[PDB]
Amino acid sequence: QKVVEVAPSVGLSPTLRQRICDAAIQLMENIKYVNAGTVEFLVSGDEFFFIEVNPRVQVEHTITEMVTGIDIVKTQILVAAGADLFGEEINMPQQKDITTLGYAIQCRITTEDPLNDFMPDTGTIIAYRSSGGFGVRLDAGDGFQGAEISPYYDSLLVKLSTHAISFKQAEEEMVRSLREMRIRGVKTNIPFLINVMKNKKFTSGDYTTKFIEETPELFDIQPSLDRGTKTLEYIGNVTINGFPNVEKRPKPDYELASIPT
Amino acid sequence: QIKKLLVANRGEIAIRIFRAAAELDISTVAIYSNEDKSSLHRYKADESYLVGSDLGPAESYLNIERIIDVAKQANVDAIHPGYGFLSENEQFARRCAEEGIKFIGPHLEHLDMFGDKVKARTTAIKADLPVIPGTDGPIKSYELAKEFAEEAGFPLMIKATSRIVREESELEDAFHRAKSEAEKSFGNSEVYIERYIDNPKHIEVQVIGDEHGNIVHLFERDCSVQRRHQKVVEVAPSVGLSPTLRQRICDAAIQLMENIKYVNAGTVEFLVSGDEFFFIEVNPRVQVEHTITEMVTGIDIVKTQILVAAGADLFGEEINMPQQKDITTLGYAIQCRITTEDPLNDFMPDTGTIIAYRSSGGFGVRLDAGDGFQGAEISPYYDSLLVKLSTHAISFKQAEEEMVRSLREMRIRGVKTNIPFLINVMKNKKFTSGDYTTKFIEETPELFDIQPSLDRGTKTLEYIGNVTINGFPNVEKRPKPDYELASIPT
Amino acid sequence: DKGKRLIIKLETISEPDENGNRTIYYAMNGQARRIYIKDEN
Amino acid sequence: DKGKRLIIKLETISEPDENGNRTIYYAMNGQARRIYIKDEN
Numbered sequence A: 001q002k003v004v005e006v007a008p009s010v011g012l013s014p015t016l017r018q019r020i021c022d023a024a025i026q027l028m029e030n031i032k033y034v035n036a037g038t039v040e041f042l043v044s045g046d047e048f049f050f051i052e053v054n055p056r057v058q059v060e061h062t063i064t065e066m067v068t069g070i071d072i073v074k075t076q077i078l079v080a081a082g083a084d085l086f087g088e089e090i091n092m093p094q095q096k097d098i099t100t101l102g103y104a105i106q107c108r109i110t111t112e113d114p115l116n117d118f119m120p121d122t123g124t125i126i127a128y129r130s131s132g133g134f135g136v137r138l139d140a141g142d143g144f145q146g147a148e149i150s151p152y153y154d155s156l157l158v159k160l161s162t163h164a165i166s167f168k169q170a171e172e173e174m175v176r177s178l179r180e181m182r183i184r185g186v187k188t189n190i191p192f193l194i195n196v197m198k199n200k201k202f203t204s205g206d207y208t209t210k211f212i213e214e215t216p217e218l219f220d221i222q223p224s225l226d227r228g229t230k231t232l233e234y235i236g237n238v239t240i241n242g243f244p245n246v247e248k249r250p251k252p253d254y255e256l257a258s259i260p261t
Numbered sequence B: 001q002i003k004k005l006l007v008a009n010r011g012e013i014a015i016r017i018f019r020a021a022a023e024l025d026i027s028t029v030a031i032y033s034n035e036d037k038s039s040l041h042r043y044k045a046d047e048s049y050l051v052g053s054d055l056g057p058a059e060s061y062l063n064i065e066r067i068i069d070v071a072k073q074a075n076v077d078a079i080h081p082g083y084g085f086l087s088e089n090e091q092f093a094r095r096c097a098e099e100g101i102k103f104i105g106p107h108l109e110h111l112d113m114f115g116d117k118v119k120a121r122t123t124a125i126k127a128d129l130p131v132i133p134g135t136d137g138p139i140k141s142y143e144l145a146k147e148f149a150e151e152a153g154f155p156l157m158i159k160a161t162s163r164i165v166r167e168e169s170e171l172e173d174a175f176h177r178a179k180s181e182a183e184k185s186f187g188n189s190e191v192y193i194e195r196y197i198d199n200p201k202h203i204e205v206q207v208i209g210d211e212h213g214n215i216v217h218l219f220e221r222d223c224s225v226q227r228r229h230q231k232v233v234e235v236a237p238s239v240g241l242s243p244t245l246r247q248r249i250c251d252a253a254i255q256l257m258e259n260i261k262y263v264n265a266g267t268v269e270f271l272v273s274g275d276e277f278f279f280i281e282v283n284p285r286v287q288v289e290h291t292i293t294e295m296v297t298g299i300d301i302v303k304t305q306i307l308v309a310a311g312a313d314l315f316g317e318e319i320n321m322p323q324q325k326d327i328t329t330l331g332y333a334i335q336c337r338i339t340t341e342d343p344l345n346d347f348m349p350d351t352g353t354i355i356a357y358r359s360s361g362g363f364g365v366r367l368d369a370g371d372g373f374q375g376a377e378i379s380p381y382y383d384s385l386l387v388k389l390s391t392h393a394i395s396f397k398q399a400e401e402e403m404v405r406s407l408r409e410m411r412i413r414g415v416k417t418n419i420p421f422l423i424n425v426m427k428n429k430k431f432t433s434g435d436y437t438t439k440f441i442e443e444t445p446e447l448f449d450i451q452p453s454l455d456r457g458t459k460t461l462e463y464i465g466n467v468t469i470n471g472f473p474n475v476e477k478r479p480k481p482d483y484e485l486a487s488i489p490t
Numbered sequence C, D: 001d002k003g004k005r006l007i008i009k010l011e012t013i014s015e016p017d018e019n020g021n022r023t024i025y026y027a028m029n030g031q032a033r034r035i036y037i038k039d040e041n
């Protein structure tokens, strides 16, 4: 299953790209495709092999919007309303003028507790803070404050995507964002995604599908360190179940102390 | 050479720097006044320190010595001033360097050059840039009204070196106000009159220089929509500027800066009427609205500032700037600041606790956090800025739309905001066209056709509430009795 | 209206304050909310 | 630590639910933050 999606591929030759595209325009031309669609492929060195078509939009479309500045979903809608691709509403540039400025990365913040083997955790979200700033894009899913996550659906709290002239910058930003988000009440895959994002093998660029299975220390985790989280557990235990050997009373009103230093 | 960095500022721009620095693996340090005790930017760095248990919040972020003191205490390699406190102040930059700290900025001589409106007048002319004709120096010695009179051209003005004045001796006698104004808010207190250039577009250019002599510009921001003093909305690049006009301004921008060997990011401000342009000022620093420029170029302006301060070269593997002809805009982007300036009531900053808070997101949308989050208390002490919102699309129409709809989808409760006002602006035929000038707000009275919107929800919450606490008439006041279900056939 | 409904949950009412104004904690459509109501002891 | 430090503010507590847990409404470092506690009475 897809964990992290980069566009455009930082590992393709100028020419492979051209062919892998050239091909897609001819399959879809041939069968006169309309609206949006993903022809999946498989590359191995210099030759590549058609695998799949997805007659629809894909989760990871945002990546492609960031690097080209086209609104795929909006066009989808405009296209259905019967509208010249090159006309007014869509203003889509001609083939020879579409380009990809910079690099862009995506990943889905889910509730797959990578410590209970990726079982999607369930329950009530008791704190939710995401991020932003320079080329960061958040598409909301199920995650809000007080949100209620159930067994019944493929869990996805936030789609997070980042972009930048340089693939390292787009990486440096995604990782920053992951370390900033604080999602409480539920376990998430954030620690695992951080680990992918920070790996030599990933940030390098040459990686195959065997990337993950061939990398043990992605699953190296210590269950998150909390100075701030455990302490609240205390301050609101004593407040209600007391403290063994002190007058149950309310916190008495104490003299202000003056503390020479 | 920069392992750890302090930000001599507060709010959104602190939070922006912390994030740049974060991404460079640089560790981050924040300062705060007594009144910023619970302010978001404090929590967004690694370390944070109070400035003075005893220093008025007014003056807590301008105390050169204590800031540097707090800096030395913590092996800070660099301070980023941000904007609008100690950001344009040579004394601070001087005192930084001496204590072995790297002021992330241009050179002392670029600060002194530009700190004065007169110093920066000469500079502009002596680099062959157009200038607004005005009192050749400032004036002091009084009756300083009666003189420059009838010798330049009809439209005039009194500005005050860092009011209209249409004459008829409305000069000596609108020369009563000056004792409490350019003494307290401005730097060195001085005053000099200028030809009033009517109906001007306000266009500024973003520039960046490394310490190796390479400068580039990142095109122009259109800062024309403003309400009196201050900027309301910025658009980049200027939707309503001709291809050549945009060049000449961009060429001048870079003629001034190439000419006095500028370094780091600064901004050249111009005033634009028909086909003539004029030099207003330079801003030797990042501006609030730089976000706009990052969006249409792709360059990270703040990350770059830091890296230039560390001696990186523009064209090197680490800042990685395109040669100029490769720097391009792609689409249009727009910015506006969600503040608590209440539109209905003479735009007071408003003051309170935010109870509910919700932003936007998706395509085209970028939020730079400020003072505002669910928990927060907003105070009367610094300029209210809850969130910076910027949007971006290939087309300016798509851009703006994208903006109204995330202005509308937003939800901030507990304080009043400028959202109703901002929405009216984004919506307006005049703005949508792109052709607008700086009198856009003067000329549009519809813009203040704010009306307090109905909301079925809040009202309902306020009834239920009443009845729950203080019950309903004739009805035996008692907890809501538990009733039988009984299903409604249909 | 048709397909527009309010889902409202009352979480708590606080204890009255200096001048008898209780604080209702609601949730209403995936949104935390706070209303202020005059008590009459 | 030196220059780190928590800031906690307690808003209210809710009367227990059916599992006898109470809701604390906290604010810690500028995020609203709620925690559950089983009462012992």
Ligand SMILES: Nc1ncnc2c1ncn2[C@@H]1O[C@H](COP(=O)(O)OP(=O)(O)O)[C@@H](O)[C@H]1O
Pocket (backbone or CB within 6 Å): B132, B157, B159, B194, B195, B196, B197, B198, B200, B202, B229, B271, B280, B281, B438
């Ligand atoms: N001589 C002038 N003629 C016409 N418009 C002007 C003139 N001087 C300033 N303005 C306008 O008024 C605004 C305020 O002036 P400015 O000196 O730039 O203030 P600030 O230093 O706060 O930016 C400017 O943004 C510009 O649009």
